[PDB]
Each structure stands twice: as structure tokens, then as C-alpha cells.
Design an enzyme around this catalytic site. Sequence first.
Site, PDB file in Angstrom:
ATOM      1  N   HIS A 250       0.810  -1.212   0.000  1.00 46.39           N
ATOM      2  CA  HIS A 250       0.000   0.000   0.000  1.00 46.39           C
ATOM      3  C   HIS A 250       0.847   1.268   0.000  1.00 46.39           C
ATOM      4  CE1 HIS A 250       0.275  -0.429   4.557  1.00 46.39           C
ATOM      5  NE2 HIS A 250       0.611   0.836   4.379  1.00 46.39           N
TER       6      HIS A 250
ATOM      7  N   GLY B 201       2.835   5.948  10.022  1.00 43.97           N
ATOM      8  CA  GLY B 201       4.205   5.823   9.579  1.00 43.97           C
ATOM      9  C   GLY B 201       4.917   4.575  10.054  1.00 43.97           C
TER      10      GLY B 201
ATOM     11  N   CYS C  92       4.038   1.560   9.436  1.00 45.69           N
ATOM     12  CA  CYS C  92       3.896   0.477   8.473  1.00 45.69           C
ATOM     13  C   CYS C  92       5.255   0.045   7.943  1.00 45.69           C
ATOM     14  CB  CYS C  92       2.988   0.913   7.323  1.00 45.69           C
ATOM     15  SG  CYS C  92       1.295   1.218   7.848  1.00 45.69           S
TER      16      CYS C  92
HETATM   17  C1  LIG Z   1       0.252   7.087   3.608  1.00 42.68           C
HETATM   18  N1  LIG Z   1       0.742   6.289   4.721  1.00 42.68           N
HETATM   19  C2  LIG Z   1      -0.110   5.523   5.408  1.00 42.68           C
HETATM   20  C3  LIG Z   1       0.319   4.743   6.482  1.00 42.68           C
HETATM   21  C4  LIG Z   1      -0.702   3.874   7.234  1.00 42.68           C
HETATM   22  C5  LIG Z   1      -1.719   3.229   6.536  1.00 42.68           C
HETATM   23  C6  LIG Z   1      -2.625   2.436   7.230  1.00 42.68           C
HETATM   24  C7  LIG Z   1      -3.743   1.733   6.459  1.00 42.68           C
HETATM   25  C8  LIG Z   1      -3.452   1.023   5.291  1.00 42.68           C
HETATM   26  C9  LIG Z   1      -4.474   0.384   4.595  1.00 42.68           C
HETATM   27 CL1  LIG Z   1      -4.177  -0.528   3.091  1.00 42.68          CL
HETATM   28  C10 LIG Z   1      -5.776   0.451   5.062  1.00 42.68           C
HETATM   29  F1  LIG Z   1      -6.745  -0.189   4.353  1.00 42.68           F
HETATM   30  C11 LIG Z   1      -6.059   1.151   6.231  1.00 42.68           C
HETATM   31  O1  LIG Z   1      -7.367   1.240   6.712  1.00 42.68           O
HETATM   32  C12 LIG Z   1      -7.621   0.626   7.948  1.00 42.68           C
HETATM   33  C13 LIG Z   1      -9.134   0.707   8.149  1.00 42.68           C
HETATM   34  C14 LIG Z   1      -9.699   1.963   8.306  1.00 42.68           C
HETATM   35  C15 LIG Z   1     -11.069   2.083   8.480  1.00 42.68           C
HETATM   36  C16 LIG Z   1     -11.874   0.950   8.499  1.00 42.68           C
HETATM   37  C17 LIG Z   1     -11.310  -0.304   8.339  1.00 42.68           C
HETATM   38  C18 LIG Z   1      -9.940  -0.430   8.162  1.00 42.68           C
HETATM   39 CL2  LIG Z   1      -9.249  -2.062   7.961  1.00 42.68          CL
HETATM   40  C19 LIG Z   1      -5.045   1.797   6.923  1.00 42.68           C
HETATM   41  C20 LIG Z   1      -2.528   2.288   8.613  1.00 42.68           C
HETATM   42  O2  LIG Z   1      -3.330   1.591   9.235  1.00 42.68           O
HETATM   43  N2  LIG Z   1      -1.535   2.925   9.251  1.00 42.68           N
HETATM   44  C21 LIG Z   1      -1.364   2.808  10.690  1.00 42.68           C
HETATM   45  C22 LIG Z   1      -1.571   3.875  11.547  1.00 42.68           C
HETATM   46  C23 LIG Z   1      -1.384   3.673  12.912  1.00 42.68           C
HETATM   47  C24 LIG Z   1      -0.998   2.421  13.372  1.00 42.68           C
HETATM   48  N3  LIG Z   1      -0.803   1.412  12.524  1.00 42.68           N
HETATM   49  C25 LIG Z   1      -0.976   1.580  11.213  1.00 42.68           C
HETATM   50  C26 LIG Z   1      -0.653   3.685   8.604  1.00 42.68           C
HETATM   51  C27 LIG Z   1       1.676   4.802   6.806  1.00 42.68           C
HETATM   52  O3  LIG Z   1       2.158   4.157   7.738  1.00 42.68           O
HETATM   53  N4  LIG Z   1       2.484   5.586   6.084  1.00 42.68           N
HETATM   54  C28 LIG Z   1       2.032   6.320   5.059  1.00 42.68           C
HETATM   55  O4  LIG Z   1       2.794   6.997   4.457  1.00 42.68           O
END
Ligand SMILES: Cn1cc(-c2cc(-c3cc(Cl)c(F)c(OCc4ccccc4Cl)c3)c(=O)n(-c3cccnc3)c2)c(=O)[nH]c1=O
EC number: 3.4.19.12
Lengths: 301, 301
Positions: free
Chosen positions: B41, B143, B145
Site C-alpha cells: 500500500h 508511519g 507500516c
Molecule cells: C500514507 N501512509 C499511510 C500509512 C498507514 C496506513 C494504514 C492503512 C493502510 C491500509 Cl491498506 C488500510 F486499508 C487502512 O485502513 C484501515 C481501516 C480503516 C477504516 C476501516 C477499516 C480499516 Cl481495515 C489503513 C494504517 O493503518 N496505518 C497505521 C496507523 C497507525 C498504526 N498502525 C498503522 C498507517 C503509513 O504508515 N504511512 C504512510 O505513508
Amino acid sequence: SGFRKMAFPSGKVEGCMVQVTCGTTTLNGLWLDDVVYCPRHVICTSEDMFNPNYEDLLIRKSNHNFLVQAGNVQLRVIGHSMQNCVLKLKVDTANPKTPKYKFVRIQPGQTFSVLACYNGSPSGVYQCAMRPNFTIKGSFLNGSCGSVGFNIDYDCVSFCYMHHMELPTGVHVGTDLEGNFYGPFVDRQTAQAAGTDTTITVNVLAWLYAAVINGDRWFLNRFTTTLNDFNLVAMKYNYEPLTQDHVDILGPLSAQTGIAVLDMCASLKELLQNGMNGRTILGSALLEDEFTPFDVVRQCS
Amino acid sequence: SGFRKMAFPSGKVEGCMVQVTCGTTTLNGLWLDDVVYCPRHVICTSEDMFNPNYEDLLIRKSNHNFLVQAGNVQLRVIGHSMQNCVLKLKVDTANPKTPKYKFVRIQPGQTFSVLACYNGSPSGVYQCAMRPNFTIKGSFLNGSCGSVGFNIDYDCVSFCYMHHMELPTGVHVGTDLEGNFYGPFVDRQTAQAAGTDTTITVNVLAWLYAAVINGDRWFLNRFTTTLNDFNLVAMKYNYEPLTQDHVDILGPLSAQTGIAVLDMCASLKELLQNGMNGRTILGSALLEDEFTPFDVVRQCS
Ligand SMILES: Cn1cc(-c2cc(-c3cc(Cl)c(F)c(OCc4ccccc4Cl)c3)c(=O)n(-c3cccnc3)c2)c(=O)[nH]c1=O
Ligand SMILES: Cn1cc(-c2cc(-c3cc(Cl)c(F)c(OCc4ccccc4Cl)c3)c(=O)n(-c3cccnc3)c2)c(=O)[nH]c1=O
């Protein structure tokens, strides 16, 4: 989100850990620049530990009696000295993995990471706090002596603890890197008690702020209190008294959550006087006091 | 003595963490040999996360669109591919810090260390368990991830987890290093529930053995039970059923302490039916299920 007892990454310290052997005793040492630091009781025998004369014992040793091994590399010892309860071995080679570092003496209530080592080989890492009575509740087995505690600020490793002894009570005591013990303890196998311990009030409050940040808010109530009134309850339940310096340190968490410090004290007071009644806070059924306000901001930032 | 939730030393993994940037998104990757692994992603935009077509999205990217930075060193990307929910970037340089390593898929109930990272820079390390419902209760911020979970056997790093998402409930889900999610989850921002969770019975028993080893024995009683009888109580309190394979795994701890497994089950049964009545076990007022029998032997050895 989420909140966990989190240690610093240990890589920078793993590269400093060595094995020190003197006579039949082997424990861990810390190799920084061209000096190896380890507990001075590495020069003791079993019969020596009850009242050792470390000056006399050290006089019977020579440079070649100290075997320092960094992984598979033997280090040549060119000098040895004693500073308080720490032995300092000068070696002819600077540790190429020496990070930026300082020696610091932490205060009671502050936290640090412990890298548990055996035969100079890292075993595991965990966070713990210097109790008000200058002990720590860690996980240490025979041979763990010389393991160190530390904090890391970007690239600077602040070493604050070297492990020396486990008391008959099962608690752990040690020194700063200048060999000065935390607490009243001495490196002799003789009776020595740790003072009465207390709970770190400011850390409990910081932990309640961390709970609110992460969604646990059932303990927030409609009450408030005063610094003096809360300290009446603190004394009853063996909590450290809360000061204005403590309130100031909690300022950031207060601002981030919009909960006044004294309002949160009213919640803690209610928890102390009524318990949790079977509920939990951040997955714990007791009040946690091993997170500092700085730890909470770090993790929650 | 003492018992703590202990992580593996993280140095070997710190040297593999890199930053991966694609478009405006930046997260963490794992650099092993000449391949960088990260969540797929990383190629998504905000509007893409609800139902992204990863094949179509990946087709619009070229090698030069993937910016991989190892500390201050930029890596030249010579190839890119997608395996399940993981992106694999071929770089023209092998990581000189690549430890011995394997990819493994852990089972529910097993534990591992998490190295939380941000912008490819390690932040902290903690131990957690794969819940029966294939979630983990960690500490992850935006961040994070691409952070990975792992175990270490002497010098071999077994990578078992890469972090991908936090669900609306605050729990964390991810994949093995071949990009296969643990649990039913998919990398789309759409409704998805985690199954009912349960308590890891064999880990609770191992933890009670660790308590006895370290001096906590007030919960030992004069009773015993049967596998079938205990499972009646397990079901009532949402504990995983105990099997003979579980009894076998507890054999060593049983032998070390002289407490028969079924005798210890009788203690756990009594704790489940009566609570701790305000007492504590190894500093906890609840029953801990995140220590495996192997973890207990490791720490207690
Ligand atoms: C652009 N971007 C994005 C992320 C990033 C993406 C995510 C993330 C990725 C995908 Cl594919 C999702 F479908 C998603 O929706 C989760 C969700 C939301 C609502 C209903 C059901 C569901 Cl299932 C979330 C994330 O969850 N987190 C995160 C945050 C806090 C702790 N752990 C994880 C972080 C990143 O880290 N860096 C970066 O640059
Ligand atoms: C030969 N040898 C010895 C040690 C080693 C020495 C000690 C140790 C060192 C000194 Cl100076 C002591 F006065 C001492 O008596 C503690 C004590 C006993 C009884 C009453 C009061 C007191 Cl205060 C103990 C130790 O406590 N531990 C340890 C064990 C488990 C967890 N933590 C620490 C280990 C070692 O590690 N390696 C190695 O080779």
C-alpha cells in the site's frame, strides 16, 4: 494507537558488550573507546565475597590476568585501575563500534532500558524504572553482572546503570558507570536492606494520561482536588508526594488532552480509595508507575 | 531471578531497516541481500485506500519512482514486483549488514519481538503475541507500516511479521514476509471484523510455572483436575481448550518445578472461578497469556 512498555533499540549497545574473565570468574564488560568497564567483584573468589579487601585483591592481579574477549577477538590489556566499585581495563584498541555516549546518574523514578547479557553476549532487552529506594525489579540470572542500562537520544547513548548484585529479597542493585552504587548498597555478601519503597505518583498520572489518549477514559469523574488534599491521600497509600515541579512536567500531557492535572489527580484519588472494581486500564488491573511523562510523549508521538 | 516481558536484542534487525518513498507516501522497508520488502500500500493515495486495484496502481510506477534510502545512502532500484500484499524492490547492492535469516509463518499463541520504526529509523522494541484471532496488541503510530516482528535463534533471525494496518478497534494486523495476511484481513479501508479472541491457556500455565520458579506460590492448592474437567472451565471463561500436545510442551517446566501439569491446571481453575481476591502474581493482578513455555525456559535459563 496502543501503549506498551517499550525499550530503546539495543544495537548501539550490543556492539559494546564484551566478556571479562579473571581467575575463574566471568562476567560482562562495556567496551567504549579503549576502556573496558566491569564490576570490580570480577576479581573475587567465592570465599572473598563476605568481606573482600578489593585493594588487596586487585594488587595480586596483573594486566595479563584480565582476559577480555570481544566476540571471537581477544583484546590486549595494557592497564587496569579501580574507580569506586568499577574496574577499568585499558586496552590497546579502540572499539570501532563505539557510539556517541555519555555517563549519567539518573534519579529515582526515571526509566531506562536494560540489555541483559551473559558471557558478553546479549540475551534480551526490557525497560525498567529506578525505584524510589534505588533498586530495580529486573530479570537477572547468575552471570548477568556487567549488563548495563541506558537511554538513547537520537544518536547519543546515555549509560546510567551497571548490574552488580541481586539481594536476598530478589531485587537488583547496581552502580552508575563511575562505580557509585545507587542506594545504600555495598558489593559485599553481608546483610543489607533496601529502604521502604513508594509508588512514583507523577508516573502513575502520566500513565493515566496515556490511557485517556488511547481510549481508556472510564476513570474520568466529575470531581477535582487540591495539591494538599491529594497529598493527604498519597501519604495514606504510600505514594510519593506530588509537587509543583511534577505538575509542571505534566503540563504537555495536560495540554494535549485538555484534562487539568488536578482533575486527573481527583481520578487517581478515586482509584486509590475505591480500587478498579474489576475493571482494567491499558490492559492492567493495577496502577502502573514505570512510565515517565517523557516516555508517554515519546510513545504517543 | 525475576520475570519480565523481554524482547530479543534488535541490533541485527536495525541494520536492515530502510525508508521507502513512493509518490507522497513514506514507510519502512526491510533490506535483506539485494531485496527491499515493504507493504504494497506504499503505492496508494488517500483516495485509493477504499478499494485500490494494486495491479493497476503498480503498473503506473517505474523503478525510479521507488526511493529507497538506507540511513543517508540512496539505493538504486533495478526491479520491482508484488507478492501477495508485499512489494519486493530489487536493488543493485546487497545489504552488507544482512544477518543470517529465514522467513517463517508463526502460529497463534506464539510470541515475537517488534522493532517499531518510523521513516526507516528504529524507535523501540517490545514483545507481543499473535492472538488466537490473528491480531496483535502493539504500539503503532502513523508511519509505522513496514515495521517487522522477529525471533532470533543464536545468530539466525526468523522474520514472522510485517505491520500493515490498525483496525478501527485499535488492534494491529499484518502479513508474513511473503505478503500473506495473518487472519481474514485485506489491505483495503473497508469494514472488516476480527474474530472472537480467546486466552492462550498453555501460555497462562507456563506463566504460572514461571511464578512458582520465582517465588510466587500462594496460588498452589491441594486440588487436582482432569483434562476434560478443566476444559469445561476453560470453555466457560473463554480459554483455549487444553490438549495433550499442550501438556507435552509443558513437560520441562513440570519437571523443573515438580508440579504436575494437571495439578497446575487445578490452580488455574481455582483462579478462574474465584479471581485473585486482590492478590498479585509476578506483579500482575490479571492472568498473563503472552509468555510461551519456550519464553519461560529461555528467561529462566
Ligand atoms: C500514507 N501512509 C499511510 C500509512 C498507514 C496506513 C494504514 C492503512 C493502510 C491500509 Cl491498506 C488500510 F486499508 C487502512 O485502513 C484501515 C481501516 C480503516 C477504516 C476501516 C477499516 C480499516 Cl481495515 C489503513 C494504517 O493503518 N496505518 C497505521 C496507523 C497507525 C498504526 N498502525 C498503522 C498507517 C503509513 O504508515 N504511512 C504512510 O505513508
Ligand atoms: C562469580 N560470579 C558471580 C556473579 C554474581 C555475583 C553476585 C554477587 C556479587 C557480590 Cl559483590 C555480592 F556481595 C553478592 O551477594 C549478594 C548478597 C547475598 C546474600 C546476602 C546479601 C547480599 Cl547483598 C552477590 C550476584 O548477585 N550475581 C547475580 C545473580 C543473579 C542475579 N543478579 C546477580 C551474580 C556473576 O555474575 N558472575 C560470576 O562469575
